């Protein structure tokens, strides 16, 4: 004459031990509770439902991308101008004013332009006085250029789709100012200490430039950012792409020399000191005079003076083992396997090893 209720919601409300059943089995494990999901039905299906004719006519009244870019750039410039300057105290570092009203205009600019900008990088370039001036000047130049001569990336995409349905000139002034301000933001982000984010920003910043000198400079900057982020593979790739663009660069630009430096440093971090010395030798034979190459050559020689005294060379099975820079330490602090929490012995990963995917 008694009833059996395995697991029912308590007096205060349904807990996770019952919501797990609610999401997997479909209802509570007792069966006495009727499944009622009207709220989530209204939140999902009633919202995503759109009639066919209205769905088809929606694409006719989308906003004009040129006007959207102009308005977003205007509002973002107004916001970054209204943003106050940090007052420097003496004895303690003053907390920079948090960017509360800057996230919305920056987000609109990002979703209109197709590139992502770091909030930490924006905060750092606003804290830095000279970087703030560079960013403001570049943003005003970009505003004037997109208001006077349209959007060069949008026109390039339109011409690309047109030639696909049926060449590439040099970079325009708007794209030049854009890559300039993106490099400024990346420099601020590096000063703040987010190397992965800086590399991710520069990876999309390189897409706007088409001239060989700008591409070589962006490749050198990406090589340095990846070197600081401990992504030696991409660092070396960009560093050698700089020297690949070298034959078409102006004689006054040292972006290719910086790319040589980044490539040699990536080799040194990969522990191929012979390859790094060969790379810096080639770089010196190219540019006999360059401090970025000379300092690195001196450091590599100072290391090579002691290299044969310990093991006569670096081992083969022990390469890319010693963690040098703290960026990979900071990344492993989050991506590391815990003690008894998440590892090859925990079942949530053991089943991932067992099953194909």
């Amino acid at each position: 004459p008694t009833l059996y209720l395995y697991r029912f919601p308590g007096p205060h409300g349904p807990g996770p031990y019952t919501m797990k059943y609610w999401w997997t089995l479909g209802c509570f494990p007792t069966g006495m509770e009727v499944p009622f999901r009207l709220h989530e039905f209204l939140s999902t299906y009633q919202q995503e439902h759109v009639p066919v004719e209205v769905e088809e006519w929606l694409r006719c009244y989308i906003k004009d991308p040129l006007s959207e870019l102009v308005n977003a750039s205007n509002d973002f410039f107004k916001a970054v101008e209204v943003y106050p300057e940090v007052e420097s105290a003496r004895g303690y570092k003053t907390l920079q004013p948090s960017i509360a009203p800057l996230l919305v205009p920056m987000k609109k600019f990002e979703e209109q332009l197709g590139v992502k900008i770091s909030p930490v990088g924006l905060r750092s370039v606003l804290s830095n006085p000279v970087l703030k001036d560079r960013f403001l000047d570049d943003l005003f130049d970009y505003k004037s250029y997109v208001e006077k001569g349209g959007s060069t990336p949008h026109r390039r995409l339109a011409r690309s789709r047109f030639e696909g349905s049926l060449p590439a000139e040099t970079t325009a002034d708007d794209e030049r100012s854009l890559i300039l301000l993106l490099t400024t933001i990346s420099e601020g982000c590096i000063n703040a200490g987010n190397y992965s984010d800086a590399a991710s920003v520069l990876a999309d910043a390189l897409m706007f430039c088409h001239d060989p000198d700008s591409q070589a400079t962006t490749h050198a900057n990406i090589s340095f950012a990846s070197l600081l982020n401990a992504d030696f593979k991409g660092a070396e790739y960009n560093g050698r792409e700089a020297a690949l663009l070298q034959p078409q660069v102006k004689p006054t630009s040292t972006a290719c020399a910086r790319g040589y430096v980044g490539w040699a440093a990536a080799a040194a971090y990969q522990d191929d000191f012979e390859k790094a010395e060969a790379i810096v030798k080639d770089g010196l034979t190219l540019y006999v005079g360059n401090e970025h190459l000379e300092k690195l050559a001196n450091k590599l020689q100072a290391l090579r003076e002691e290299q044969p005294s310990v093991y006569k060379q670096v081992p083969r099975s022990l390469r890319e083992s010693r963690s040098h820079l703290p960026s990979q330490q900071s990344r492993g602090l989050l991506s590391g396997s815990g003690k008894g929490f998440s590892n090859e012995f925990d079942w949530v990963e053991f089943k991932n090893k067992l099953y194909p995917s």
């Binding site: 088809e56 006519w57 694409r59 006719c60 009244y61 989308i62 906003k63 004009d64 991308p65 959207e68 979703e111 209109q112 332009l113 197709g114 590139v115 990336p153 949008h154 995409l157 339109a158 999309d204 897409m207």
Partner: peptide, 13 residues
């Protein structure tokens, strides 16, 4: 990485 594109002409009258 594709930009926001231009809306389409009216399909019908």
């Amino acid at each position: 990485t594709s930009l926001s594109r231009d809306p389409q002409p009216p399909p019908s009258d």
